[PDB]
Amino acid sequence: TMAEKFRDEGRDVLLFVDNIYRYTLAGTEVSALLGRMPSAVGYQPTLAEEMGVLQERITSTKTGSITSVQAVYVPADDLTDPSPATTFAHLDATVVLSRQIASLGIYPAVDPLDSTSR
């Protein structure tokens, strides 16, 4: 919301979100108590809508622009877990870090065969 307010003033803004995964995770913890039947690997049924309702309002417009960097934790290093898989679609540039490269001491541990950009 603060990023959006700075955008609407006609400015251009930087937005750094240090772990967006924890936004979906905090929903899962609550999802079962709200009386909703569990989905694929435990996540709430509304995972993709809960994620899109946020990711879709962080965007540039004709009055102002938001340039954003989001950290995206992947659980158990599984890039096919529903949350990373459903997050991949919302980004323009995806830089995929990997543990195998980091164990070689090669920082930054970017995987060039998986990072891409629009």
């Binding site: 290093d77 543990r99 195998q100 490269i101 164990s103």
Partner: protein, 69 residues
């Protein structure tokens, strides 16, 4: 070659001659001026090598096991 109380025959293994050896050298030169090469007779190595080439092919082990190297 014969010695006191000993003798040896250093026998040739094939007929030797001015013309035969020159024919063999001529073929040895031709095979090098071209790039023509023959096939070794080790059918056992051929069998095992093709079997190992097909068995090792396309098995995506690395990146299946998380082995960096």
């Amino acid at each position: 070659e014969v010695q006191p109380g000993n003798v040896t025959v250093l026998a040739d293994t094939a007929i030797r001659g001015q013309d035969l050896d020159e024919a063999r050298a001529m073929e040895a030169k031709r095979k090098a001026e071209e790039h023509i090469s023959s096939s070794h007779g080790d059918v056992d190595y051929a069998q095992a090598s093709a079997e190992l080439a097909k068995a090792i092919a396309q098995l995506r082990v690395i990146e299946l096991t998380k082995k960096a190297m």
